[PDB]
Amino acid sequence: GMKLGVNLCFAVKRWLEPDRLAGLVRDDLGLEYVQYTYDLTDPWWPDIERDRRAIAYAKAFRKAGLTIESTFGGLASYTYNHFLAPTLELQSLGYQHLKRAIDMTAAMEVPATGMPFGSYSAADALNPARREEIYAIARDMWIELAAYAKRQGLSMLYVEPVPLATEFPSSAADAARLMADLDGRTEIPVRLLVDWGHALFEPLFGPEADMDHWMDLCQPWIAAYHIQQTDGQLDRHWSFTQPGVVTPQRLQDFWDKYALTDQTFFAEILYPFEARDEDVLADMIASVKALKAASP
Amino acid sequence: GMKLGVNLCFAVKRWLEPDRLAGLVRDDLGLEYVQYTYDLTDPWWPDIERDRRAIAYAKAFRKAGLTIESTFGGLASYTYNHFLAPTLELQSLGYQHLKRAIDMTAAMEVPATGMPFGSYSAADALNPARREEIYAIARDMWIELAAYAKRQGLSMLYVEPVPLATEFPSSAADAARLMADLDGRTEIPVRLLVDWGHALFEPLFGPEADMDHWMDLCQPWIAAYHIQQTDGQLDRHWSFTQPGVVTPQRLQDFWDKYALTDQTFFAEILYPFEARDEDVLADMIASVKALKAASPA
Ligand SMILES: [Cl-]
Ligand SMILES: [Cl-]
Ligand SMILES: [Cl-]
Ligand SMILES: [Fe+3]
Ligand SMILES: [Fe+3]
Ligand SMILES: [Mn+2]
Ligand SMILES: [Mn+2]
After folding, report:
1. DSSP B10-75
2. Pair B58, B109: CB distance under 8 Å
3. What is the C-alpha to C-alpha distance for residues A161 and B27, in angstroms, rounded to an integer?
4. How close A81 comes to chain B (CA, Å)?
5. Less packed terminus of chain A by CB within 10 Å, N or C?
6. What is the CATH number of the domain that holds B285?
7. Number of domains within chain A
8. Sign of the CA dihedral with B21 first, then B23, B28, and B30 last
9. Which of A79, A81, A89 sits opposite B16 (nearest CB)?
10. How far is the CA of A17 from the centre of ligand 4 (A)?
11. Superkingdom of this entry's organism (chain B) (predicted)?
């Protein structure tokens, strides 16, 4: 069936021991394809200690026979505005964040990394001229960072669109424009990672909260996915033990409809900090079994 | 009335212009006491750019007539395990995290900073020997960091207990132990900031999920609070337009019962990222109006 994976966001703060985490993904989840989260080792940490730990993960995962296909921004990263921030200095700290995340990913010998693109201030979000001026700087920064990433040995970067009018890209049309702006201008490809819970967010996208609309405008650029359960009313990141609009069969039918091959459906499931480790692990296991029960 | 303040977590990613943020707290929320969040300027950022931005917020708030009483950890910070992490290198990254936060706080001329103490890994959380080993290192770290803070001009550090058995301090008994261990050993005081949603978390604390139990074991050490609305079943951080067990009047009755004076009740309200700016702002204003509506004895 569908190529399933897991983003390690479920394990944040909890199963930190590299061999224990690899074993959990292999033996408990029965999954092979992994996306490593910045929420395990912060790009900003001094590089010696950061990379020592990130490399320990990379080694443990290789040894368990798992494939870390990419690293990706998480909640610590998403807290700040990065490339669409309201000052050049803050946008340059976005450059430096991603530059450092690229270094860490190269230390892991992982081929790709990505993140949401960034976020406008409240004032800037309301001002199209301001948005475009900021964006032009951001777009040039990603050209330079693609070149850097290529020199570090990476093969691809990703941008993850978001369900916010105050950020970019939000809509399938926004993502199409970003992808056109970068295509033929970057030394390695910059592609889209589309999160099902973002695309299906109804309050912002209404009748365009629809994955066919994403394929219509963006199919050729979508290189990977985040999957999660949601009611379409907030970005839930629920597991597949929970009810909502993203049934496992809906996922498998999309997979088959578009003849997908290597565009990993990474489960990106978030738990409240205060949930107990045993309950999170049980839930994650039942959730993966629910996903694997879809009929191809 | 009770001493209300606001933690700037509600503004993260949104009202970032320093004078607009300051004016919003002053004019729209009608408040004076502020807790600045690490979520606006990351302690890890390079010092020069980091302090330029942090200092711009400090100056704008001071000019608007607001008092930034402390800086405090937010979600970016809480993502990591820090002082209770399973390797000494990860613990040392927690040390450096707070050291850098102290640098940023001194640059702002803010007198105090704090955060939750840190977090055990899943394996270590179940090994009392490991917990003890890790904690003894953590405690020694905070001693050194209190010495550094004093040298940088700070007056106080805070630890925020949390509603997880995998972290310490969690219970009022944990918090009393940490406080007792550190009292007389630190060059400036290390005190508790208690979040009403953490103390009132029922699934962990059962009948000890209430604030009188916190005063019974910890009163002398609780120097500030986070207030939020909650149903007591998860750590909600709801605003005071929402139903739940932490009513404005209950907060005012607690404030009067214990003769509190300067121990600021900072509203710490969390909004989904995807909520619209104007909806967050409207709700925050109605929430602060609800809090001000409480009736003092
Ligand atoms: Cl572990
Ligand atoms: Cl703004
Ligand atoms: Cl440092
Ligand atoms: Fe996602
Ligand atoms: Fe809190
Ligand atoms: Mn999301
Ligand atoms: Mn909390």
Report:
1. GGTTTS-SHHHHHHIIIIIS---EEEEETTTS-TTS-HHHHHHHHHHHHHHHHHTT-EEEEEE--H
2. yes
3. 34
4. 6
5. C
6. 3.20.20.150
7. 1
8. positive
9. A81
10. 24
11. Bacteria
Contacts of A246 (CB under 8 A, 6+ apart): A196, A197, A200, A227, A228, A229, A230
- Name which of B21, B112, B97 is nearest B62 in CA terms: B21
In chain B, the N- to C-terminal Cα span, in Å, equals 9
What is the CB neighbour count within 10 angstroms for residue B293?
12
**Those residues with Cβ within 8 angstroms of residue B97's Cβ, 6 or more apart along the chain or in another chain:** B43, B44, B77, B80, B82
Tell me how the structure was determined: X-ray
Q: Which two tokens stand for residue B48?
A: 């020069």
Beta strands, E only, B95-221: 112-115, 156-159, 190-195
Q: How far apart are CA A25 and CA A62, in angstroms?
A: 12
Which two three-digit tokens encode residue B173? Answer: 């008994």
Relative to beta strand A4-7, strand A265-267 is parallel
Domain residues for B159? 1-297
Q: Resolution reached, in Å? A: 1.9
- Which ranges constitute the DSSP H helices of chain A? 18-23, 47-63, 75-78, 88-107, 122-125, 128-152, 172-182, 196-199, 202-205, 211-218, 248-257, 277-292
* Cross-chain residue pair A122–B16, CB shorter than 8 Å: yes
Ligand nearest the Cα of residue B73 is 5
